[PDB]
Every structure is written in C-alpha cells, then in structure tokens.
C-alpha cells in the first residue's frame, strides 16, 4: 500500500541499499504532518453520518432525475438509495484511511483501481460522486492544515473521477 | 507491503469500518514515539558494515567448519554470498523497524529462504546464529545511552529483537 513509509523503503529496496538519511527525513515529514492528518481523520469519522447524509442529498439536489428515473442504477428505490449512501460512505471511509496512512494508497487500492470499469459497467455517473465529494469538502468543518489534509485527498478522489 | 498504519487500515477495510478512538490513539502514539524509531534505524544503518563483519568473524571463529575447505563459506564466491546474505537480512530487518511491521521482511526476504538454503545445502542453523549475533550488536548500538537525548526505548528494542528472532526462526 502506498504510504510515505512503504514508498521510502521501496526506493531503498529497488536500489538494493540500506535506508539513508534521504528516506529517514521523508518519514519524519510524514510523522510531523500526521498531527494534522489524524485531526482530519478523527473529525471526518466523528461527523461521518451527517457528512454522508448531507452529501447524498447534495447529489440528489444537483441531479433530481436520480430520485425519480426508473432503473436499478438510480436512487429511485429504497435499494438504490441504500446503494448510494453506501457508496458515499465508502468514499468518506477511504479518505479517512488515506489520512491515517499518510498517502493515497488505501484509496488507490480499494477504490480507484477498477473505478472506471465499474462506473461504466453499472451505468453510474462519475459526476454524481464528484458532487458528493464537493459537498464533503465544503462542509467538513475543518480549518488550518487539517483542512488542507482533508481537501488534498478529497480533491485526489475528484481528480480520479474526472 | 505494509507499515504499522497501513496494517490497521487493511484490517478495518476488510470489516468495512471507520477507525475507533482506541485505534486512532494507538497510531497517534506510534507517531509520538517516532523519533526513537528513526534513531534506531539511523544507528543500526550507520554501523551496518561493522555489525555484519563482526558477526561474520565471530560466526567463523565459533564454527570453523564453515571455513574449512569443503565448508559452505569456503571459496571467496561462497564467502561473499554469505556476507551478502547477512547484509541483506540486516537490511530487511531495518526496513521492518522503520515500517513498524514485519510484512516487508516476511514477504521480500524470509519467504522461501528456508527452501533456498535447503536446495543449496547452506546450513540454515548457522545463518540463524549469524542473525542472532547481529541482533545483539544492533540493539547495543541502537540503545546506546551516549550521544542522544535520554529516554526509554525498551519497547522499541523489544520490537527490534522480535524481527531479528523472526528472521532467525525463518531460516533455522
Ligand atoms: C532509543 C533509540 C535511544 C533514545 C532515543 C531518543 N531520541 C529522541 C529524540 C529525537 N530523535 C531525533 C532523531 C531523528 N529525527 C529525524 O528526523 C531523523 C532522520 C533524519 C532522526 C535520526 C530527533 C530530531 C529528536 C528530537 C530532538 C532531540 O535530539 O532531542 C528521544 C526523545 C523523544 C521523541 O520521541 O521525540 C529519545 C528518548 N534515547 C535513549 O536513551 C536510547 C539510547
Ligand atoms: C450514489 C452517488 C448514486 C448511485 C449509486 C449506486 N451505486 C450502485 C452500485 C455499485 N456501487 C459500487 C461502488 C463501489 N463498490 C466498491 O467496492 C467500492 C470501493 C470500496 C465502490 C466505490 C459498485 C461496485 C456497484 C455495483 C455492485 C453492487 O451492487 O454493489 C447502485 C446499484 C446499481 C444496480 O444496477 O443495482 C446504485 C443505485 N445511484 C444514484 O442514483 C446516485 C446518484
Ligand atoms: C552465511 C550466513 C551462511 C551461508 C550463505 C550462503 N548463501 C548463499 C546463496 C544464496 N543466498 C540467497 C538468499 C537471498 N537472495 C535474495 O535475493 C534474497 C532477498 C533479497 C535472499 C534472502 C540466494 C537466492 C542464494 C543463491 C544464489 C546466489 O548465491 O547468487 C551461498 C552460496 C552457495 C553456493 O554458491 O553454492 C552461501 C555460501 N553459507 C554459510 O556457510 C553460512 C552458514
């Protein structure tokens, strides 16, 4: 999984060498930034339900047809509404994992890989998830570097969907 | 591979849940103790050559059969291979220390090592003796109270010893 730490040792390993000061400084950077990252992760987790609920409604408001259009890929049924809330929660959970790991690894492996194939196969619109992510960014309530951390990973997800 | 953080994340994902306060606290603690971990890796790495060479000399002094004609470390080719292995083992052990998880060590080094030595005819028991030697020397250097801000690194030394023993068991 991609993290500043596994990355640092991956570099030393590919070079067949012991870790150097070059890699140690990298890991220290990660340890220091962890303060802001953990703050962001705890906050998003604490307010996970309201963020997911609010994000889902933001999507339905931006795209009203998803609440009425017939089809299993839409949120026009209780099962579809549940699938959607589920997905939004997955995205939020992944961002907290990224903050915890200090890298995109968690999202890269559990969500981004195969993402395009999935959305295409099940006729799910990337624009839906982008709107949910934009709502989370606008309303997570974080400030300072904690907000910088959260937004970096939220925007990473948005970019992966664009 | 995985580090201490990715490990917790992977366990959580398999269960589909966010992290608990206890988990956040645990990982937060690791970060709080980070400086000690960096010091240990820097110290062991900075003395890697001496650790390997001293352990190698000791091994051959105690087990002279390895260096007698016909022995497994006889000929410069085999001696070089042996020294290389010790450096490789020490290298992956330090990676595990930095990661706070043995995954990299188990996956990229110890996996199939047993089988490799068996096919070559290399005495894994002796390799384990060499590993144990580097462990004692590595911990002595990493935990040297001189030249560093005083503090307790006992838990860290216990963790480090665990990786060395893990490697020793995988080949012995
Ligand atoms: C246990 C191994 C021994 C010990 C360690 C100990 N070290 C510190 C504190 C610091 N360690 C560093 C080292 C680094 N920072 C880096 O970024 C890098 C890589 C380039 C390294 C190698 C630093 C900067 C500090 C803080 C400043 C200082 O010198 O004090 C502590 C204090 C704790 C902490 O977790 O921050 C301790 C206890 N002490 C011992 O007695 C053992 C022999
Ligand atoms: C919500 C923004 C909108 C929407 C969602 C919706 N999604 C599905 C089905 C699936 N969603 C996923 C997504 C993931 N699976 C994963 O493992 C991960 C990473 C951890 C993600 C992000 C997948 C794979 C599916 C298909 C398989 C399944 O059902 O689990 C549906 C159901 C579609 C169907 O045809 O049954 C829906 C309705 N729908 C909307 O209207 C919103 C705008
Ligand atoms: C020294 C402690 C003992 C010893 C060792 C010895 N080892 C070999 C040969 C090999 N060692 C490995 C191990 C690895 N290769 C890797 O890439 C990795 C991970 C990064 C590991 C752990 C392998 C694959 C070999 C065989 C291939 C090669 O040598 O290039 C030898 C050579 C034996 C021979 O040529 O017949 C020796 C001598 N020997 C001892 O007597 C000590 C107890």
Coordinates of C-alpha atoms and ligand atoms in Angstrom, one line a residue:
Chain A
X1 CA 0.0 0.0 0.0
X2 CA 1.3 3.4 -1.0
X3 CA 2.4 5.5 2.1
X4 CA 5.4 7.7 2.6
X5 CA 7.0 4.9 4.7
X6 CA 6.4 2.0 2.3
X7 CA 7.5 4.3 -0.5
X8 CA 10.7 5.2 1.3
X9 CA 11.7 1.6 1.8
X10 CA 10.5 0.6 -1.7
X11 CA 13.1 3.1 -3.1
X12 CA 15.9 1.7 -0.9
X13 CA 14.9 -1.9 -1.8
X14 CA 14.8 -1.3 -5.6
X15 CA 18.3 0.3 -5.2
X16 CA 19.3 -2.7 -3.1
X17 CA 20.5 -0.4 -0.3
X18 CA 20.0 0.4 3.3
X19 CA 17.8 3.3 4.2
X20 CA 19.6 6.5 4.1
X21 CA 19.1 9.9 5.7
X22 CA 17.3 10.7 2.5
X23 CA 14.5 8.2 3.4
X24 CA 14.6 9.0 7.1
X25 CA 13.8 12.7 6.5
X26 CA 10.9 11.6 4.3
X27 CA 9.4 9.5 7.1
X28 CA 9.9 12.3 9.6
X29 CA 8.0 14.6 7.3
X30 CA 5.2 12.1 7.5
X31 CA 5.4 11.8 11.2
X32 CA 5.1 15.6 11.7
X33 CA 2.3 16.0 9.2
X34 CA 0.5 13.2 11.0
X35 CA -0.7 15.6 13.6
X36 CA -2.8 17.5 11.1
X37 CA -3.7 14.3 9.2
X38 CA -5.0 12.5 12.3
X39 CA -7.0 15.5 13.3
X40 CA -8.7 15.5 9.9
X41 CA -9.3 11.7 10.0
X42 CA -10.8 11.8 13.5
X43 CA -13.1 14.7 12.6
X44 CA -14.4 13.2 9.4
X45 CA -15.0 9.9 11.2
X46 CA -16.8 11.6 14.1
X47 CA -19.1 13.5 11.7
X48 CA -19.3 10.7 9.1
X49 CA -23.0 10.2 9.3
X50 CA -24.0 13.8 8.8
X51 CA -21.5 14.2 6.0
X52 CA -22.7 11.1 4.2
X53 CA -26.3 12.0 4.6
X54 CA -25.7 15.6 3.5
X55 CA -23.6 14.5 0.6
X56 CA -26.2 12.1 -0.7
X57 CA -28.9 14.9 -0.6
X58 CA -26.5 17.2 -2.4
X59 CA -26.2 14.8 -5.2
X60 CA -30.0 14.3 -5.4
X61 CA -30.5 18.1 -5.4
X62 CA -27.9 18.6 -8.2
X63 CA -29.3 15.7 -10.2
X64 CA -33.0 15.4 -9.4
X65 CA -33.5 12.7 -12.0
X66 CA -31.6 10.2 -9.9
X67 CA -34.5 10.2 -7.4
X68 CA -37.2 9.5 -10.0
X69 CA -35.8 7.8 -13.0
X70 CA -36.6 4.1 -13.4
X71 CA -33.6 1.7 -13.3
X72 CA -31.5 -0.1 -10.7
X73 CA -28.6 2.3 -11.3
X74 CA -30.6 5.2 -9.9
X75 CA -31.7 6.1 -6.3
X76 CA -35.4 6.0 -7.1
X77 CA -36.0 3.0 -4.9
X78 CA -35.1 2.1 -1.3
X79 CA -32.4 -0.3 -2.5
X80 CA -30.9 2.4 -4.8
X81 CA -30.9 5.0 -2.1
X82 CA -29.2 2.5 0.2
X83 CA -26.6 1.6 -2.5
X84 CA -25.9 5.3 -2.9
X85 CA -25.5 6.1 0.8
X86 CA -23.3 3.0 0.9
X87 CA -21.0 4.3 -1.9
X88 CA -20.7 7.8 -0.4
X89 CA -19.8 6.2 2.9
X90 CA -17.1 4.2 1.1
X91 CA -15.6 7.3 -0.4
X92 CA -15.5 9.0 3.0
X93 CA -14.1 5.9 4.7
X94 CA -11.3 5.8 2.1
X95 CA -10.4 9.4 2.6
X96 CA -10.0 8.8 6.4
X97 CA -7.8 5.8 5.6
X98 CA -5.6 7.9 3.4
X99 CA -5.3 10.5 6.2
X100 CA -4.4 7.7 8.6
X101 CA -1.9 6.1 6.3
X102 CA -0.5 9.5 5.2
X103 CA -0.9 8.6 1.5
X104 CA -3.3 7.7 -1.4
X105 CA -2.5 4.0 -1.0
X106 CA -5.8 3.0 0.6
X107 CA -8.0 4.8 -1.9
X108 CA -5.8 3.7 -4.8
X109 CA -6.1 0.0 -4.0
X110 CA -9.6 -0.3 -2.6
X111 CA -11.4 2.2 -4.7
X112 CA -9.6 3.8 -7.7
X113 CA -8.3 0.6 -9.3
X114 CA -11.1 -0.6 -11.5
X115 CA -13.2 2.5 -10.8
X116 CA -13.7 3.4 -14.4
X117 CA -14.7 -0.1 -15.3
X118 CA -17.2 -0.2 -12.5
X119 CA -18.9 3.1 -13.3
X120 CA -19.2 2.1 -17.0
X121 CA -20.5 -1.4 -16.3
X122 CA -23.2 -0.4 -13.8
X123 CA -24.0 2.9 -15.5
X124 CA -23.1 5.0 -12.5
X125 CA -22.2 8.6 -13.3
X126 CA -18.8 10.0 -12.1
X127 CA -20.4 13.4 -11.9
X128 CA -22.6 12.0 -9.0
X129 CA -19.7 11.1 -6.9
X130 CA -17.9 14.4 -7.7
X131 CA -20.8 16.3 -6.4
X132 CA -20.8 14.3 -3.2
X133 CA -17.1 14.9 -2.7
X134 CA -17.5 18.6 -3.3
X135 CA -20.2 18.7 -0.6
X136 CA -17.8 16.9 1.9
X137 CA -15.0 19.4 1.1
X138 CA -17.3 22.4 1.6
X139 CA -18.8 21.1 4.8
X140 CA -16.3 19.0 6.8
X141 CA -15.8 22.0 9.1
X142 CA -12.0 21.6 9.4
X143 CA -9.7 24.6 9.3
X144 CA -5.9 25.2 9.0
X145 CA -3.6 22.4 7.9
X146 CA -6.2 19.8 9.0
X147 CA -8.5 21.2 6.2
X148 CA -5.5 21.2 3.8
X149 CA -5.0 17.5 4.5
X150 CA -8.7 16.5 4.1
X151 CA -9.0 18.6 0.9
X152 CA -5.9 17.1 -0.6
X153 CA -7.4 13.6 -0.5
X154 CA -11.0 14.8 -1.4
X155 CA -9.6 16.5 -4.4
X156 CA -7.5 13.4 -5.3
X157 CA -10.8 11.5 -5.4
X158 CA -12.4 14.2 -7.6
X159 CA -9.5 14.1 -10.0
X160 CA -9.7 10.3 -10.2
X161 CA -13.3 10.7 -11.3
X162 CA -12.5 13.3 -13.9
Chain B
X1 CA 4.0 -4.1 1.6
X2 CA 2.5 -2.5 4.8
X3 CA 3.7 -0.3 7.6
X4 CA 2.1 -0.1 11.0
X5 CA -0.5 2.4 9.7
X6 CA -1.5 0.5 6.5
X7 CA -1.8 -2.6 8.7
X8 CA -4.6 -1.1 10.8
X9 CA -6.3 0.4 7.7
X10 CA -6.3 -3.0 5.9
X11 CA -7.9 -4.7 8.9
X12 CA -10.5 -2.0 9.1
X13 CA -11.3 -2.2 5.4
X14 CA -11.9 -5.9 5.5
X15 CA -14.5 -5.2 8.2
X16 CA -15.8 -2.2 6.3
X17 CA -15.5 0.2 9.2
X18 CA -14.0 3.5 10.2
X19 CA -11.3 3.5 12.8
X20 CA -12.2 3.6 16.5
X21 CA -10.8 6.1 19.0
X22 CA -8.6 3.4 20.5
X23 CA -7.1 2.7 17.1
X24 CA -6.5 6.4 16.3
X25 CA -4.9 6.7 19.8
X26 CA -2.7 3.7 19.1
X27 CA -1.4 5.1 15.8
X28 CA -1.1 8.6 17.3
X29 CA 1.1 7.0 20.0
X30 CA 3.3 5.5 17.3
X31 CA 3.9 8.9 15.8
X32 CA 4.6 10.3 19.2
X33 CA 7.3 7.7 19.6
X34 CA 8.7 8.2 16.0
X35 CA 11.9 9.9 16.9
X36 CA 13.2 6.8 18.8
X37 CA 12.4 4.6 15.8
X38 CA 14.3 6.9 13.4
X39 CA 17.2 7.0 15.8
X40 CA 17.3 3.2 15.9
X41 CA 17.2 2.8 12.1
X42 CA 19.9 5.5 11.7
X43 CA 22.2 4.0 14.3
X44 CA 21.9 0.4 13.0
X45 CA 22.3 1.5 9.4
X46 CA 25.3 3.8 10.2
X47 CA 27.1 0.8 11.6
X48 CA 25.9 -1.9 9.2
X49 CA 29.3 -2.8 8.0
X50 CA 30.8 -3.4 11.4
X51 CA 27.7 -5.3 12.6
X52 CA 27.9 -7.7 9.6
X53 CA 31.7 -8.1 9.7
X54 CA 31.9 -8.5 13.5
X55 CA 29.1 -11.1 13.4
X56 CA 30.7 -12.9 10.5
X57 CA 34.1 -13.1 12.1
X58 CA 32.5 -14.4 15.4
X59 CA 30.5 -17.0 13.4
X60 CA 33.6 -18.4 11.7
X61 CA 35.6 -18.4 14.9
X62 CA 32.9 -20.4 16.7
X63 CA 32.0 -22.6 13.7
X64 CA 35.4 -23.1 11.9
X65 CA 33.9 -26.0 9.8
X66 CA 32.2 -23.3 7.7
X67 CA 35.6 -22.0 6.6
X68 CA 37.5 -25.3 6.1
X69 CA 37.9 -26.5 2.5
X70 CA 34.6 -28.1 1.6
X71 CA 32.8 -25.9 4.1
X72 CA 29.8 -23.9 2.9
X73 CA 31.5 -20.5 3.3
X74 CA 34.7 -21.8 1.7
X75 CA 36.0 -20.1 -1.5
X76 CA 35.6 -16.3 -1.9
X77 CA 32.5 -16.9 -4.0
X78 CA 30.6 -18.6 -1.2
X79 CA 32.1 -16.3 1.5
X80 CA 30.9 -13.2 -0.5
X81 CA 27.5 -14.8 -0.9
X82 CA 27.3 -15.4 2.9
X83 CA 28.4 -11.9 3.8
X84 CA 25.8 -10.6 1.2
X85 CA 23.1 -12.6 2.9
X86 CA 23.9 -11.2 6.3
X87 CA 23.8 -7.7 4.9
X88 CA 20.5 -8.5 3.1
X89 CA 18.9 -9.8 6.3
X90 CA 20.1 -6.9 8.3
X91 CA 18.8 -4.6 5.6
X92 CA 15.3 -6.0 5.6
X93 CA 15.2 -6.1 9.4
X94 CA 15.9 -2.3 9.4
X95 CA 13.1 -1.8 6.8
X96 CA 10.8 -3.6 9.3
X97 CA 11.9 -1.3 12.1
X98 CA 11.2 1.8 10.0
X99 CA 7.8 0.4 9.0
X100 CA 6.8 -0.8 12.4
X101 CA 5.6 -4.0 10.7
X102 CA 7.3 -7.2 9.6
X103 CA 5.5 -7.5 6.3
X104 CA 8.3 -6.3 4.1
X105 CA 10.7 -8.7 5.9
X106 CA 8.4 -11.7 5.6
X107 CA 7.5 -11.0 2.0
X108 CA 10.6 -9.8 0.3
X109 CA 13.3 -11.7 2.3
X110 CA 12.2 -14.6 4.6
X111 CA 9.6 -16.1 2.2
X112 CA 11.2 -19.2 0.6
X113 CA 14.6 -18.5 2.2
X114 CA 14.3 -21.9 4.1
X115 CA 13.8 -23.7 0.9
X116 CA 16.6 -21.8 -0.8
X117 CA 19.2 -22.8 1.7
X118 CA 18.0 -26.4 1.6
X119 CA 18.3 -26.6 -2.1
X120 CA 21.8 -25.0 -2.0
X121 CA 23.0 -27.1 1.0
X122 CA 23.6 -24.0 3.2
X123 CA 23.2 -24.7 6.9
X124 CA 20.3 -22.5 8.0
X125 CA 21.1 -23.2 11.6
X126 CA 24.4 -21.4 11.2
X127 CA 22.6 -18.5 9.4
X128 CA 20.4 -18.2 12.4
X129 CA 23.4 -18.0 14.6
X130 CA 24.8 -15.1 12.5
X131 CA 21.4 -13.3 12.7
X132 CA 21.3 -13.6 16.5
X133 CA 24.8 -12.1 16.6
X134 CA 23.8 -9.1 14.5
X135 CA 20.7 -8.7 16.7
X136 CA 22.8 -8.3 19.9
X137 CA 25.1 -5.9 18.2
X138 CA 22.3 -3.9 16.5
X139 CA 20.4 -3.5 19.8
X140 CA 23.6 -2.5 21.7
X141 CA 24.2 0.3 19.2
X142 CA 20.6 1.4 18.8
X143 CA 20.1 1.5 22.6
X144 CA 23.5 3.2 23.5
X145 CA 22.6 5.9 26.0
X146 CA 25.5 8.0 24.9
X147 CA 25.1 10.8 22.3
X148 CA 21.3 11.1 22.4
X149 CA 18.5 12.7 24.5
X150 CA 17.8 10.3 27.4
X151 CA 14.6 8.3 27.3
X152 CA 13.2 4.8 27.4
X153 CA 13.3 2.7 24.2
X154 CA 12.8 -0.7 25.8
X155 CA 9.5 -1.4 24.0
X156 CA 11.2 -0.4 20.7
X157 CA 14.2 -2.7 21.5
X158 CA 11.8 -5.5 22.2
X159 CA 10.1 -4.9 18.9
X160 CA 13.5 -4.9 17.1
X161 CA 14.6 -8.1 18.8
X162 CA 11.3 -9.6 17.6
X163 CA 12.2 -9.0 13.9
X164 CA 15.7 -10.5 14.3
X165 CA 14.2 -13.5 16.0
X166 CA 11.6 -13.8 13.3
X167 CA 14.3 -13.9 10.7
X168 CA 16.3 -16.4 12.7
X169 CA 13.3 -18.7 13.0
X170 CA 12.6 -18.5 9.3
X171 CA 15.9 -19.9 8.4
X172 CA 16.9 -22.1 11.4
Ligands
LIG1 C1 16.5 4.8 21.9 C2 16.8 4.5 20.4 C3 17.6 5.8 22.5 C4 17.0 7.2 22.7 C5 16.3 8.0 21.7 C6 15.6 9.2 21.7 N1 15.7 10.0 20.6 C7 14.8 11.1 20.9 C8 14.6 12.2 20.0 C9 14.9 12.7 18.8 N2 15.4 11.8 17.9 C10 15.7 12.5 16.7 C11 16.2 11.8 15.5 C12 15.9 12.0 14.2 N3 14.9 12.9 13.7 C13 14.9 12.7 12.4 O1 14.2 13.4 11.6 C14 15.8 11.7 11.9 C15 16.1 11.3 10.4 C16 16.8 12.3 9.5 C17 16.5 11.3 13.0 C18 17.6 10.2 13.1 C19 15.3 14.0 16.9 C20 15.4 15.2 15.9 C21 14.8 14.0 18.2 C22 14.3 15.3 19.0 C23 15.4 16.3 19.4 C24 16.4 15.7 20.3 O2 17.6 15.5 19.9 O3 16.0 15.5 21.5 C25 14.2 10.9 22.2 C26 13.2 11.9 22.8 C27 11.8 11.6 22.1 C28 10.9 11.6 20.9 O4 10.1 10.7 20.7 O5 10.9 12.7 20.2 C29 14.7 9.7 22.7 C30 14.2 9.2 24.1 N4 17.2 7.7 24.0 C31 17.8 6.7 24.7 O6 18.1 6.9 25.9 C32 18.2 5.5 23.9 C33 19.6 5.1 23.8
LIG2 C1 -24.7 7.4 -5.5 C2 -23.7 8.6 -5.6 C3 -25.5 7.3 -6.9 C4 -25.9 5.8 -7.2 C5 -25.2 4.7 -6.7 C6 -25.4 3.3 -7.0 N1 -24.3 2.5 -6.9 C7 -24.7 1.2 -7.2 C8 -23.8 0.1 -7.2 C9 -22.5 -0.1 -7.1 N2 -21.7 0.9 -6.5 C10 -20.4 0.4 -6.5 C11 -19.3 1.1 -5.9 C12 -18.2 0.6 -5.1 N3 -18.0 -0.7 -4.9 C13 -16.9 -0.8 -4.2 O1 -16.4 -1.9 -3.8 C14 -16.2 0.5 -3.9 C15 -14.9 0.8 -3.2 C16 -14.8 0.2 -1.8 C17 -17.1 1.4 -4.5 C18 -16.9 2.9 -4.6 C19 -20.4 -1.0 -7.2 C20 -19.2 -1.9 -7.5 C21 -21.7 -1.2 -7.5 C22 -22.2 -2.4 -8.3 C23 -22.3 -3.7 -7.4 C24 -23.2 -3.6 -6.2 O2 -24.4 -3.5 -6.3 O3 -22.6 -3.5 -5.1 C25 -26.1 1.2 -7.4 C26 -26.8 -0.2 -7.7 C27 -26.9 -0.4 -9.2 C28 -27.6 -1.6 -9.8 O4 -27.7 -1.8 -11.0 O5 -28.1 -2.4 -8.9 C29 -26.6 2.5 -7.2 C30 -28.1 2.8 -7.4 N4 -27.2 5.8 -7.7 C31 -27.7 7.1 -7.7 O6 -28.8 7.3 -8.2 C32 -26.8 8.1 -7.2 C33 -26.6 9.4 -8.0
LIG3 C1 26.2 -17.2 5.7 C2 25.2 -16.7 6.9 C3 25.8 -18.7 5.5 C4 25.9 -19.0 4.1 C5 25.2 -18.4 3.0 C6 25.2 -18.6 1.6 N1 24.1 -18.2 0.9 C7 24.3 -18.4 -0.4 C8 23.4 -18.2 -1.5 C9 22.1 -17.6 -1.7 N2 21.5 -16.8 -0.7 C10 20.3 -16.4 -1.3 C11 19.4 -15.5 -0.5 C12 18.7 -14.4 -0.9 N3 18.7 -14.0 -2.2 C13 17.9 -12.9 -2.3 O1 17.8 -12.2 -3.3 C14 17.3 -12.6 -1.0 C15 16.3 -11.4 -0.7 C16 16.8 -10.0 -1.1 C17 17.8 -13.5 -0.2 C18 17.4 -13.7 1.3 C19 20.1 -16.9 -2.7 C20 19.0 -16.8 -3.7 C21 21.3 -17.7 -2.9 C22 21.7 -18.4 -4.2 C23 22.1 -17.6 -5.4 C24 23.4 -16.9 -5.3 O2 24.3 -17.3 -4.5 O3 23.6 -15.9 -6.0 C25 25.5 -19.1 -0.6 C26 26.1 -19.6 -2.0 C27 26.1 -21.1 -2.1 C28 26.7 -21.7 -3.4 O4 27.1 -20.9 -4.3 O5 26.7 -23.0 -3.5 C29 26.1 -19.2 0.6 C30 27.5 -19.8 0.9 N4 26.8 -20.1 3.9 C31 27.3 -20.4 5.1 O6 28.2 -21.4 5.3 C32 26.8 -19.7 6.3 C33 26.1 -20.5 7.3

